[PDB]
């Protein structure tokens, strides 16, 4: 990672911590045990949900969109219509893939 904490000087995670993302593990005379940290986990949850909602709200819903018909003497406009459809589809595919790829990192 960019900060060298996860898989850095802390080599692995804990499967015994079930109620949070980051926490502590203590051990003394009384006994040992795990305990999650609430403030950092809450802030991270807020940020992640905000990011997901922002991603969702930027892509509007598709309405009705059906095809057209052309005769045998109207090939130019038919080709233009096909070109427009293909171009828009390609642009939106590129946008979606790039957005996901960047937000994961």
């Amino acid at each position, epitope marked *: 990672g960019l900060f060298g904490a996860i898989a850095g000087f802390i080599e692995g995670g804990w499967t015994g911590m079930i*109620d949070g993302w980051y926490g502590y593990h203590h051990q003394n005379e009384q006994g040992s045990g795990y305990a999650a940290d609430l403030k950092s*986990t*809450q802030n991270a*949850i807020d940020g992640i*949900t*905000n990011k997901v*909602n922002s991603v969702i709200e930027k892509m509007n819903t598709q309405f009705t969109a059906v095809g057209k018909e052309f005769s045998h003497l109207e090939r130019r406009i038919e080709n233009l219509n096909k070109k427009v459809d293909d171009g828009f589809i390609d642009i939106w595919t590129y946008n979606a893939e790039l957005l996901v790829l960047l937000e994961n990192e």
Partner: nanobody
Amino acid sequence: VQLVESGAEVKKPGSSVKVSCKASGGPFRSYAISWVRQAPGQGPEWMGGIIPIFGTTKYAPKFQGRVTITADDFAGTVYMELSSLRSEDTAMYYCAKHMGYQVRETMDVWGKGTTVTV
């Protein structure tokens, strides 16, 4: 934040009833959601709740084994289903939201509720 439930339900002994709760705002929540019922002339009772992202569900020992709480995240909906319905199950039902992402005693926003009758 506004929480709304479905309509009133009238059913028969031995049936199963599924109710839903819808919250305003973004489809994804940062708070847990619990289900609370009240009997006529009685105090409120707590069935269980659901936690965001982690998805763990907690239930009370009285309703354990016959209550199921699920969530549709992209629709922003929470479903609670009760099975093996009996005579005493008639009550007034609410979905309540918590202040944080964990199930606790502090529920700050309640819905109007729906009535379940046998």
